[model samples]
Target: YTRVVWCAVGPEEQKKCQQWSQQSGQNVTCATASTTDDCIVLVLKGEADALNLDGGYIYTAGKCGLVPVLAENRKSSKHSSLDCVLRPTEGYLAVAVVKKANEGLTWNSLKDKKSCHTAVDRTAGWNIPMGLIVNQTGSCAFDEFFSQSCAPGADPKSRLCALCAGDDQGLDKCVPNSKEKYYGYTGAFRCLAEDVGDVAFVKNDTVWENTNGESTADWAKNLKREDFRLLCLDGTRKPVTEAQSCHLAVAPNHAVVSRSDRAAHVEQVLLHQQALFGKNGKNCPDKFCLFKSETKNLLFNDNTECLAKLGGRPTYEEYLGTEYVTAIANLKKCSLEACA
Candidate 1:
C-alpha cells in the first residue's frame, strides 16, 4: 500500500527523497532537491526556461513532479496515479526561485536553429498582398488565396489561371496564364498545361516573386523556341499526367482549385481521370487539411463538403465536437505540457 507523492519539503526533509522512493516500492523517482532544500526540480534540464513558466517540456498525464510541500496537508498523502486525477488535464504550477542557472544558453546556442528568429523577427513580410492574414483569433494564417476573392487587387481572373505539371524531381511544368487560359489537356494529354516550362511548388501563401528568379522553374522555359518548350531537362524524359503534374506543382500545399464553382473541380478533374484516389477520392480530407493548416486559421468555414466525402466524421467524438475543436483542444493540452 505504498505510494508516490509530491510536496514542498523543507531543508530537514531533503533526505526523504530516497525514503519516499523506497516507500513507493521503488517505482517513484524524486527530482534532485534544490540547494536551499526548499523545492524539487520537476522538469528536465534544457527543456524549459527557468523564468517564463509558459514554455517547457510536457509532463505526461501519469508522471508526477515534486513541488514545495505545503504545511497544511503534510499528513494526508496521495498516490501519483490518484494525484493526476485531481489535476485538470491542465497542469502543475511552480514558483520561479529567481536564481541564475549554473550554465546559460546564448542566442546562437539554442538547439532549435530558428528559436532566435522566431522570437525576434516577428515582422517578416510577404511579397504578395494578402499573402498573410490574421484570423478571427488574432493568430497568423499565411495563405489567403483559397478564400480571398481578390488578390492584391490584381485581376481576379488571373488567380486560378496559373497552370503547372509535376514530376518526381520536382514541378517541371509551369504556366502562369491569363484567366481560363489553356494548358494542353488534349486527348493525348488531358489536363496537361498547354505551354511547357519548369515548375517549382512553393509553400502556400508564399509570394511567387520570392520563389521567382532566373531559376530553372522560370517562365522562360515556356517560350516557343527550339531549345525551350520541354527541352530544358538534361536527363531521361518521362510521360506526365495531370495528377503527377498537379502534385509536383502543389507538393506540400495540396492543390486547392482556384474557382469557387469549380471548388472541388480539382478533385473532380483528378478523379474523372482516375488520378484522385487514396483516402478522400483525391479530394482533400477535412481532417487532413485541418491537421495541415489548423481550422482556426483556414478560410473554410464548414468542411462539410470535404468531411462528407470522407464518409462523414471519422469517429463518434467527431460527431459531437468537430475534429478541429478536438484537435485545437489537444493542441492546448500539448502547449500546456510544453509550458507546464
Candidate 2:
C-alpha cells in the first residue's frame, strides 16, 4: 500500500486527512506530521510524500530541495482563470484598514497608533506593511511606529505585546502560537472591531468576509464595509474594494510541495482526490467538502477552489517570482530581532 504522510498541525486536520484517505479507497494510506518544518524533514528522509504550504514557508522548503507541484487556485469573482496555474501577479493584495470614524488616521500618521497584525511573518499582516514602513523609516524599530501592537512572535517584554489582550486567562500574551486570541486574519480584524487596535493590517478579503453577516463571529457579524477604509501608501484612504489600486503588496498563492522524485506521485493522488471533494466535485455538493472551514485554514486554505498545476515551476523562487521574493527578503530584514 502507498502511504502518504500528511503534515497536519492539529487533531482536526489529522482527522480530515484520514477521512480523505478512507474515502479515496485507493491503494493509499495517510500518516500525520506535526508541523511544516517537520513535514519538510520527513519528506527529505523519504518518510512522507507531500504537504501544502503558504508562500513564505514555500521559500524555506525550496531551500531544502522540495519542489512545488500543485498550486491552490482561489475562486474569485473579480478574475477569470484560463488554467489552474495562477500567475505571480494574479494573487491577493494586502492592505491596512482602519475604522471610518478614525478620519484623522492615515498611512503617514500611523505613528504611536495601536496596531493589529495576523502574525509575525505573515505576508499581508506583517511582511507587506512592515516592509513599506522599513523602506520609509530606514529603521526596524516598529515600536516607534505603533504606540502598542498585538504582533505575535515578538519578544514578550517588547512594546509589540503591550496592546496584546491575550485569551480569557491572559496566557501566551505575545507568543506566536495560535492559542492567543488576537492571531490570524480574523483575529486581527477582531482586534480592530473591539477597539483594541486603531488599525488592522490584513488581506483584502478580510473585511468583506468578516462583515455584513457573512461571518458568524459576534464582533463581525454586524460589520459593514462602509464602516472601514483602506490606508493607501499615498496617505489617502479608500474603500476596501479599491485595494487593487491602493495596497501594500500582491502576494503569491499557496502551493503543495513534495520531494522532486515524488512530484508525479503526489500530483496523481491530489488530482484524483480533488475530483471527488473539490469545489465543484460530486461529493462537495452535499457530502464531504475539501475547501470548507469555519475557523482556521487546515491542510489547505478554506477559500481554495481547486489544486491547479504550477506550470512546472519546480522551485519556490520561480513560482513566487523575483519581485515577490525580493519583497519578502526585504521584509525579513525587519524581523523582531533586527528591530529589537
Candidate 3:
C-alpha cells in the first residue's frame, strides 16, 4: 500500500504531520485541510488515509463509511511498564473549570458568564456541556445562555466568537484550528487561565497537564493546580484532582479512523510509528515525543499515551457506546438545525 496520508486539520497539525512524516521517513504523509469535515472528505475521496477524531466526528464519519482503527489512550492507572497499545483504555473525564477566585460562581449561577470550548462540534467542548445545558434549561438558546465565548466554528460575527483572538496578525478569528488563539482544549483552558473566559469546558487531564509547572508552555507554566476548581453538577466546587467525583461526563476516547479499504494498513503502520515516536517510544524524547506538545494538543492530544489496538475492531456506533450515540444524535436537533 502507499504511505498513509494524514489529513491535517490546520497549519499547526500540518507542520506536526510534516515532522512526523519526515521522522518516519515518509512512511506516512500529510494532507492539509481547514476543518475535520474537509479532512474526512479527503479520506472519503481517497486523497488521504486516516486521522484521529472524537466520538462526535466518528459518528459523522461512520455515517459516511469510515471505520475506527485505533483508540487514543491517555495515562492509565494499572501499570506504567505495560505497552499502551495493549492496555485497556478508560475514557477521559470532561469537566467544567472555573478559577478559584470565582467563589460567586457555581453550576447554578452560570447564566451570563463567558465560556470557552474545544470547538463547536467537539465532544467535551460542545456536545456534553452544551447538551447538558440544553437538557437542563429545556431551551435551545445556548447562544444566549452565555454572555460571550470563544467557541470556534460558530458564526464569526457572533458573541460566541467574541473571546476568540485570531493569529499574530488577527486573522482567522473564529476558525477551528490552532491559529485561533482560543481554539482547542488547551487554548480553552488558557482562556480561563488568562481570565478571558469565566469557564472552560475541557477534560480533567488538561488541568493536570497544564498546571503546577507540568507544562513549560508560557501561558500554563505559572498555573497552580490549587488556583483552579471544577464545578460539580450539584452547584458545588472541588479541586481539580476530584474530577472523578464532579465531572460533567465520562467521554469516549478519541480514536483514529480510516476508510475500510485502508484501515488495516493504517493501523499496522501506526502501531510501528508510535513504537518509534510515542511517549515511551524507542526514539521519543531523544528524537521526539508525539504525546508532548507543551500543552498544545497538536497532531494528537498532548496527553495521549499511545494509540491502543481496539478489540473486535468495533464499528463506530459500537465503539462510541449506544447511549453516547443517541445523546449526540439528540443534540444535533439544535447543533445542526435552526438553533444556530
Candidate 4:
C-alpha cells in the first residue's frame, strides 16, 4: 500500500509512468486510465497512490478526498530561484492568444469566434477564461460564444468539437486525451498556428515555447513568435512578450494528489523520486528527466524545477488560494464538479 503507485492519465503517460516505475526499482508503480477523472477515481478507490493535476482538477479531486502532497515548482521567469513571498506553485499567467494576421480581433470582439482550448476542465483553458467571460458577459453560454471550437471533452455533435481533427486515422474526435489532435497546450497552440481557431485560450509561456523555431515538430516547424499576439481584457492587443501586463489571471500550478491515508508515503517517495529525476536531479539527463517530455507536458510540466514541499503542509483549499477558489466556485454554479 505504501509503494506509491501513480495513475497515468492516458497511454502516453502510461508509457512514461512505466519508465519511471522500472527506473524507481519498484519503489513506485503505475496504473493506467483513459482520462484524468478515471485516474482520480483510481486514487479514490485506493488502487493508485497519486497523480499530478491542474488547479481545476485539484478542486475536483480535493472534494473527492484526495490530498495534495507536493506542489510543482517550475522555473520562474521573474525569479531564477524560489522567492519566499511568491512561493512554488506560485502561478503562471493565463492569456488569450490569436494570430497577428487575424487583425482587429480583441477580447471585446471574441464573440462567436472559433476557439481552441486545452480541455474542458483545465485551469487556464477553461476555468479562468470561461469564468471571466461568464462574469463579464453575465451569461453562462460560453459554448454559444464560440462559433466553433476544438475544446476537448465537449459534446462531439456540437459546434464546440467542430474544429478538432481527431487521431491520425480520424477517430476519437474531441476526446480529452492526446489522441485528439488539438488537446493540450501545444495542440491548442498548433490549432491557432494552423488557423483552425481564431483564438486560443492557453498560457503565455506556450507561445514562447512553441514559436520562433523553438519546437521541432512537423506542424510547428516554421512558426514565428512575431506572428502571434496576446488578447488583453482591456480590448487591446500586445506582442506575446507583454503577457505580464495582459494576462487573464495568475493560475495555480499543478500538484501531486493522493488519498489521505497514502499522503505521507506519497510525499516521502516523491521527494526522493524527484531528487533522482527532477530538473537538477542526480540522475537527470544521464538517466530520466521527470520534467521533460519535449513540451508534451506529460505527467508534469516540462518547466518544473522540482516538486517542492508545501510550506506548513497546507490543505487543498490553502494551496489553491481563496480568490481563485471563489472564482471557480462561482463559475461552477453557472456550470459545475467536486464529485464523489
Candidate 5:
C-alpha cells in the first residue's frame, strides 16, 4: 500500500483524510501532520508522500527540495473551463482598498493611516503590499507608516494592534492565531467594515463577497461594493472591478507538492484517489468529496474544482512565474525575521 501522509490542522481534517484512505481500500493509506511546515519536514524525511499548500509556502517547500506536481484549479466564472491545468499567473489579484469617501487617501499618501491585513506573511495581505512599501521606504519599520493597525499577526503590544477590537469576548486581540476575530480574508475585511482600519489589504473577491447582504456579519450585512475603491500603485484610485489594471500583485495558484524523487508515484496515487472523490467523481455527493470542506482547506481548498497537471514546472520560480517570484523576493528582504 502507498502511504500518503495528509497534513491536517484539526480533527475534522484528519477525519476526512482517514475516510479517503478507507475508500481507497488497500491501494493507499493516510497519516497526519499538524501543520504545513511539519508536513514539509516529514516529506523531506521520507515520512510522508505529499501535501497541498498555499503559494507562499511553495517557496519554502521548494527550497527544501520539494517539487510541485499538481495545481489546484478553482472554479470561477471568469475561468469556467475545467482544463485541469492552471496557468502560472492564473490567480486572483491582491489589492489595497479604502472607503470611497476617503478621497484624500492614496497609496503614496498612506503614512500614519490605519491599516488592516489578513495575516502576517500572507501573499496578498502582507507580502505584496509590504513589499511595495519596503521598496519605497527601504525599511521594515511598519510602525512608522501606519499610525495604528489591526494586523492580526504582529506583536500584541506593538502599534500594529492598537486598533484591533478582538473577538466578542475581547480575547486574542491582534494575535496571529485564527481564534482572533479579525483574522483571515473575511476578518480583515470586517476590520475595515467596522471602521477599525482605514484600508484593508486583501484579494479582489473579498469586498465583493462580504458586502451587499452576501455576508450576515453586522459590519457587512448592508455594505456595498460601491462604497469601496482600490488604491492603485500609480497613486490613483479606481473601482474594485478595475483591480486588473490597478492592484498590488497577481498571485500564483496553490499547489500540491512532493519530494522530487517521489513526484511520479505521488501523482499516480493522487490521480487515482481524485477520480474517486474529486468534485465530479462517482461518490462525491454521497461520500468522500474532496472539495466540500466549507470553512477549512485541509488537504485542498474547497473552492478547488480539480487538481491539474503542472507541466513539469518543478521549482517555485518556474511554477509561480518570474513576476510573482520577484515580488516575494522583494518582500523577504524587508520583512520581519518570522516572515523571511
Candidate 6:
C-alpha cells in the first residue's frame, strides 16, 4: 500500500518538489504517480516547484518566498483640485463665489444672467456651470477674482478690487473692507456654496462686475441700493430662513449640464501649452514639437491635431475660441450656488 504523509520542509527550499517529502524519509521511495515531465525535470534540476496541487499548497514565483499578497483599498491619492469637481464622491466638495472687476467675457455673461434673473437654478453645479451660454450672446461667466481699479499705474485687468457686499445686491455694489489688502482674485472669492448650503449641493449666485469704466468705487458705491434675490422656477424650493424667501420663478433658458468622469478627461495642459496651442499652432511644427512631450502635450501644443485626434472638435480655432469658451460657461451656469 502507498502511504501519503505530510512533513516540514526547509526555509529556503520549501518550494522545491521533494523538499517537504525528503526530510521525512530518504529511502522510502515512492513512485511518481502524477508528475509531468517538466515538473520532474524541474525537481531534478533543483528548480522551484512553487505549487502543490493535491496537498493544496502554492507559492508565487518571487524573491521573497511568496509572502501572501493582500488586496488593499487604494489610498485616496488626489493630485489636482479639479479632480474633486470631476469626481465629487471621491472626496469632500467645496464651492466658493468670488467678486471681480473687468472680469472677462465669461464672467460678464454669467453676471448678466444673474442680474436679469435668467439663471435656471441660481445655484450652479459642477455637472454643467455654463448652462447660460446658449443665449444669443454665446457667453458664460468664467471664474472671477478681484482686480485693482482701472486707474493710473494699474493694469486694467489685474485682480484686486473684489469686495463682499451685504445681502443679494447687484454687481459693483460691494461693502468696502476698510483694511483692504490688495490680494489677487484667487483669494478674494470665498467658498460660496459651503457658506450657504451644506456641502452636498452648492449654488453660488453672487454676480459682481466692473460697471464703471474708471475707479473701483462704482461696485462698492452704486449698486448697493438694489435688492438681489434668487428665484426658483422649478417649484421644488424649500424655505430655509425667514430673512430669505424661495418662490417658483420662470425657466426662461435651460441648458443640460452633465458630469462625466473618465480617465481621458482628467488630463490638463500646462499654461504655456494652453496659450500656444490656440488658433495657429498647427503649421508651426518646431514650436509644436518643442512643447509636445507626451500624447497630452501634443494635444495641447497643436490644438488642431489634438482635438481632431482626441475626438474633441475639428479645428484648433474652434477648440480655443469656442469649445474652451463654452466649457467655462457651462461650468459657471450649471454648478454655481448663491445666497441672499
List ranges where model 6 is wrong by over 4 Å.
1-137, 140-340
Q: By summed lDDT, which 10 consecutive residues of candidate 6 come out lowest? A: 54-63
Clashing pairs in 3: none
lDDT tens readout by residue for model 4, 72-191? 886665655654223655588899999999999999999889999999989999999999899989998888988999999889999989999889899989988888889988889989
Candidate 3 vs candidate 4: the lDDT winner is: 3
State the lDDT of candidate 6 residue by residue for 1-340, as single tens digits: 1222211121111222143245323311222322222222332233322221110011111111221111111113453343211221121111222222213323333332221110112222222232332342454323221221211112223321122222233322221111112111211222221121111112222122211221133223343212222223232222222112332111111110001121122122211222343233432343323223221111011111211122242122221234333444454453300110
Candidate 5, 262-320: lDDT as tens digits: 98888888887788889888888787787765433456756677888876655777887
lDDT to native, each model: 0.20, 0.76, 0.89, 0.87, 0.76, 0.22
How far residue 15's Cα lies from its native spot in candidate 6, in Å, is 54
- Quote the lDDT for 154 in model 1: 27
- Model 4: which residue pairs collide? none
In candidate 5, stretches whose alpha carbon ends up further than 4 angstroms from where it belongs are: 10-35, 76-82, 85-89, 161-177, 213-219, 295-299, 335-340
Residue 263 in model 3: shift from native, Å?
A: 0.6
lDDT of 3 by residue, 104-144 (tens): 79999999999999898888998999999999999989999
lDDT of 1 at 197: 14
Candidates 1 and 2: which is better by TM-score? Answer: 2
TM-score of 5: 0.82
**What would you estimate as the lDDT of candidate 3?**
0.89
The better-scoring model by TM-score among 3 and 5 is 3
190-260, model 2: which lDDT tens digit per residue?
A: 88988899999988877878888887877777889999999998879999889888888888877889989
